[PDB]
Amino acid sequence: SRGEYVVAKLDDLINWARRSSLWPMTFGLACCAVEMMHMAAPRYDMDRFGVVFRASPRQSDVMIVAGTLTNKMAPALRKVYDQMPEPRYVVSMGSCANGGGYYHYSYSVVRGCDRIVPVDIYVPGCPPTAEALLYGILQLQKKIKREKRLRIWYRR
Amino acid sequence: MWFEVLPGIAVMGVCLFIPGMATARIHRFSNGGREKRVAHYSYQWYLMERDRRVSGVNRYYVSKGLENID
Amino acid sequence: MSLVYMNIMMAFTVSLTGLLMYRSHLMSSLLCLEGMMLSLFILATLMILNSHFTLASMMPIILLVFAACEAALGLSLLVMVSNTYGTDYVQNLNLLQC
Amino acid sequence: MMTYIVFILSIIFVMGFVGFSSKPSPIYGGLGLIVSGGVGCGIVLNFGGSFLGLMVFLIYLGGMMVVFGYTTAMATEQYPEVWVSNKVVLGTFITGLLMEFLMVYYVLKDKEVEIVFKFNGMGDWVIYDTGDSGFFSEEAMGIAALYSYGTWLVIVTGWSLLIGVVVIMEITRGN
Amino acid sequence: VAAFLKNVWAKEPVLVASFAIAGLAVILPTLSPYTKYSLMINRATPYNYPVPLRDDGNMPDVPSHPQDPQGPSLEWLKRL
Amino acid sequence: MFMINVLTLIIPILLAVAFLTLVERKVLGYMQFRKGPNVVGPYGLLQPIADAIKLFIKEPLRPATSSISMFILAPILALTLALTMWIPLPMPYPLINMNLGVLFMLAMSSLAVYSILWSGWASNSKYALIGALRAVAQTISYEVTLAIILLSVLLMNGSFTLSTLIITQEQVWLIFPAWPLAMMWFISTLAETNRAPFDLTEGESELVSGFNVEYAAGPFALFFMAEYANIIMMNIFTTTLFLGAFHNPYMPELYTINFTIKSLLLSITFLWIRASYPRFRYDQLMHLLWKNFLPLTLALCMWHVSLPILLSSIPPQT
Amino acid sequence: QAEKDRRVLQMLRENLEEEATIMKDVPGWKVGESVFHTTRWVTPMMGELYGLRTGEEILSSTYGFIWYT
Amino acid sequence: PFFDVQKKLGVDLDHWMTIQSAEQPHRIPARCHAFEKEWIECAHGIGSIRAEKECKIEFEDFRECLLRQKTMKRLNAIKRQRDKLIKEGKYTPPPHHSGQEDLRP
Amino acid sequence: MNLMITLLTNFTLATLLVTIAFWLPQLNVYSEKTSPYECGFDPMGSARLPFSMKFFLVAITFLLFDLEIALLLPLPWASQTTNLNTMLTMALLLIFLLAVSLAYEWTQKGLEWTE
Ligand SMILES: CCCCCCCCCCCCCCCCCC(=O)OC[C@H](COP(=O)([O-])OCC[N+](C)(C)C)OC(=O)CCCCCCCCCCCCCCCCC
Ligand SMILES: CCCCCCCCCCCCCCCCCC(=O)OC[C@H](COP(=O)(O)OCCN)OC(=O)CCCCCCCCCCCCCCCCC
Ligand SMILES: CCCCCCCCCCCCCCCCCC(=O)OC[C@H](COP(=O)(O)OCCN)OC(=O)CCCCCCCCCCCCCCCCC
Ligand SMILES: CCCCCCCCCCCCCCCCCC(=O)OC[C@H](COP(=O)(O)OCCN)OC(=O)CCCCCCCCCCCCCCCCC
């Protein structure tokens, strides 16, 4: 049908616009934020791919959990994720933001950021290098590209 | 290198070339191939109204020359 | 007279009855003062431009200058009030009743 | 109904005056005074005084901006009233608009009204002059004659402004 | 007064420049010989119509034609 | 027919704003030893399209504690004032040939501050209030010096008409006899639009985002295009004021090309200034214009009002 | 000046001749009665000339210069 | 008290903006210059008590020139009668009053 | 005629870009996203509290100065008058009084910020 082709092309267009204009949030906690700034360094140059940091959650696309999410910090992270407009993606990077890392058995460490916020991409390492984080960003772009929003809306 | 800032800037040049000249082209289309006459002072407006009345077509840019008189 | 004269005079009377009944706030009265000044300016320049009195065109703008000669002054009569009390209510200005 | 353009602008002028003279909150009073100044400069610009309208627009925009800074600083409330948060403010705004539109309807019916003076109902376009003004606008030459003729006015105005500056310094001192 | 001038030029040169510009702008038009040139240039600009006078019979200073040699000419303005 | 003229005025300036975002990102990257966007298309030509489509399919996020009417009116007023104030600029023939275009642009530049002020006040947040009051401080810092600079530089033109400014600069540029006024005007235009080093309202260091911290996508783009159209209009205004090009009435394209490349160089100079300077404090900017610029502006105003009388060079008013 | 003088005299005469045709059955009316006690010529007012014409000429005459761009 | 300093010292301060018949810039005349000139020349030196009843014709004509009340009343009556005749269908507008008029120049 | 057409066109083009931005996408509103943003934690107090200003004196000075320099704006046209010495003297006197007022504000520590 022609309507299926139309909604498929529109879905491709909006996925291209959303995946080529990722706006992360300036939000770091620990070592992995230093590696994120080294991904923002002139060598790797995230702004080539349309990735540009934005300070406010209201004008941001994704959130990169870079560091250790402790017990005193989790409500703040949850509120910051809640304030972001849809569609919203979370990239968990580093061992601390994945499963607690070095501090899995600590009393005041949340064992992974999955317990607080939904996570799209898990980036392993301590720290995962700027090349690895750029690879995770490109993997997130590939995941956004194969979204099927308008096709499912036409099917539903 | 640096010269790759020159394509997009060039597009900006086109984006700053289109409007203004278009107004001139518009000013060369409505006013019959001449500039749009300016009326900063009331004497110029009175001359504009006299020309519009004397053209006979209710268009001030229709210029009647010395062949009109006897 | 004309019609716009009636409307500007009605605006002046509206701002006058806005000024004369206070609503426990000094800034609102200052805004009413500025509105009456604006209405007087508009009426004066309307009459002057209608009657072709060119040499009186110095009148309104100069008039407008003296607007600040009270209006900004009113603000300088507020900050001490707002240093005397935490707010700028006109019911706090009742110490001179005895 | 384009011949009554100045009348319509004056209707919006009194509408804005009713809007800010009901005193809801000085933010929205400032917005109403900005709207009133805009339509007033439109009126006087329609009468030919473009310089005077632009000048009063600029002056009142600057004054209202300083006022807004003051009310944000000093004259504020936990719950400001927009127009309907207070019964008295909404009520007096409604009766102001009702009186204005009643006067409009009465003057648009028999083209004559008696409020204390006597007013017509025709548009103001009748009272214009039919001749030209040469190579100058009268209002520009009139205000430019402030320096060639009005030496006394310039002297007293400059002295008043300097004394005003000194007065502002002296009042807000504290000791 | 040289020490005061040097100190105020080392501390705040902007005020020194402003006061020098102000002093030149105040004392200079009274020294230049070209102010009267501005005076008759402003007076020689014809805003209004030169309304003629009735010929009573004894007016030797005003001409009958604009091309007559009598009258206020502006060859000085063309020369300058 | 006038509809065609106004749409061909307002659509290319939106395209110019989008490609100004592109040029800003790429030039600012290249001045920082790195590359700008080049992966979206051929040399990154499709990045503004991706940004614009992305921002208009996101959620608007109107807050609950914010007065919704002013929250909607403020970006509309910002974009509107950014649109209907490009008109009196002669390019080389203005769309609206106002007799008092300079005062019109002054008044509508004073009016555009209220959009920032009501955006800060409407969204119930402390950072927005701080941004709005910093905008107020910036306005009272710059406005009087800007107006006196314009008055002193218009004493050689003859009148407030922007169309006659080309005729004034037909012989020589106006930057040669008024270069201190030109420098002070450039700093005033930098501080007017809240551009670096006088940002002070969208401060990402002292604040998070300032007055537009509660404005999500859709309304947030309006402030961005308003700001960028404002910087282009300041560049064109400065070019017309101080760098008047040769105008041929038979070939307006010569003047169009000339002031286009001059305004492009002025915008490049704006971004050149942006990448190289630390942010001013907003009390130091207040003491910058009121103590250093203002006395020199007064002295230069007296000099420029006593100069043409001194030299029999009073310009005509017709 | 001569053209303007003849034009306004023509317009005033045209408005005067059609005033008698419009107002002939009204009681107490006098056609062409002045409002000034003197017989000196006064400058005609815009309502006296364009009082019986269509609105396009009104907008061209009393608002044409100010609204012109 | 009115200490008339200005005529005592011969110094002109605000006598030029007092009336519209004074020395205007570039000899720009007011719209009612003749009426005000006649009223001032009529009521010069005779006192206000005599001038209120001896030069009332010139002052009434000047007030009519200032506000045009009677001209508005006459124009309103003419327009009302014309609209009433149009509504009754007894009157047709002339061709020169409808747009196709061919003015003088 | 043309100015209100341009104003209406620009107002319509501005006001159409929000109703497109509102009614187009998929919205999901809950009572945690639209809270005021205070860097992850809920704020203390309201944003309608008195925000004690410091530059009130310079604000009043700007209130006077805006119109006191707006008196100086007809100085181009004032260069076209026949009487030129009087105009030059009055303009120089006006700007001199402006400079005297500014210097009096500067010397009395009026430009400095409170607290
Ligand atoms: C439009 C054309 C191009 C313009 C230039 C654009 C490109 C260059 C841009 C450079 C970067 C600007 C970034 C922002 C900078 C902000 C700070 C700033 O501007 O501060 C201003 C600073 C302020 O100084 P400050 O901030 O250091 O303050 C010093 C304060 N005290 C002294 C107390 C310590 O300077 C000025 O205000 C100077 C303004 C221009 C002066 C021009 C003088 C001309 C010559 C006059 C005569 C001199 C001779 C003597 C008299 C002779 C008489 C015959
Ligand atoms: C009945 C028929 C019509 C039916 C309705 C549909 C009409 C058309 C809708 C828009 C176009 C739909 C197709 C969109 C692209 C689909 C293909 C795609 O995704 O291509 C990917 C390619 C980049 O590939 P990438 O994965 O990034 O490669 C890695 C790089 N090493 O991407 C590219 O190379 C670039 C893709 C560019 C897409 C077109 C340009 C953007 C849209 C412009 C028009 C709309 C917006 C106009 C302006 C709005 C205001 C700014
Ligand atoms: C004032 C001047 C303003 C100028 C503004 C625009 C500047 C840039 C102009 C265009 C520059 C080139 C852009 C190229 C985009 C990428 C095209 C492309 O390769 O698309 C491929 C994509 C997927 O196709 P696929 O099926 O994978 O191909 C099989 C290959 N073996 O297929 C698709 O994505 C589908 C086809 C998309 C085609 C898009 C073409 C460019 C559209 C740009 C929008 C504006 C156009 C101009 C508007 C103004 C003039 C009218
Ligand atoms: C609730 C919030 C507000 C929502 C609505 C917002 C609307 C847009 C607000 C921004 C624009 C405000 C404009 C204010 C008036 C500006 C006047 C102006 O631009 O004048 C320019 C020009 C003067 O030139 P001049 O010397 O007269 O030339 C004649 C000889 N050719 O003039 C001319 O050449 C004359 C052209 C025709 C003029 C007609 C009369 C004036 C029309 C005014 C329209 C209404 C303005 C309302 C402003 C509200 C502000 C809050």
Ligand SMILES: CCCCCCCCCCCCCCCCCC(=O)OC[C@H](COP(=O)(O)OCCN)OC(=O)CCCCCCCCCCCCCCCCC
């Ligand atoms: C008659 C000439 C024209 C006069 C009228 C026109 C003036 C145009 C310029 C207007 C200037 C307005 C502002 C003036 C402020 C002066 C007072 C002042 O603020 O002095 C302070 C300053 C020392 O700085 P400080 O005390 O630290 O300041 C606090 C923060 N900086 O103190 C100083 O730096 C000293 C300031 C006074 C001495 C200046 C000397 C300048 C000499 C220039 C060359 C010769 C000029 C000859 C003309 C006569 C000059 C008196």
Ligand code: SF4
């Ligand atoms: S994962 Fe390792 S590098 Fe990253 S924050 Fe934890 S300890 Fe630091």
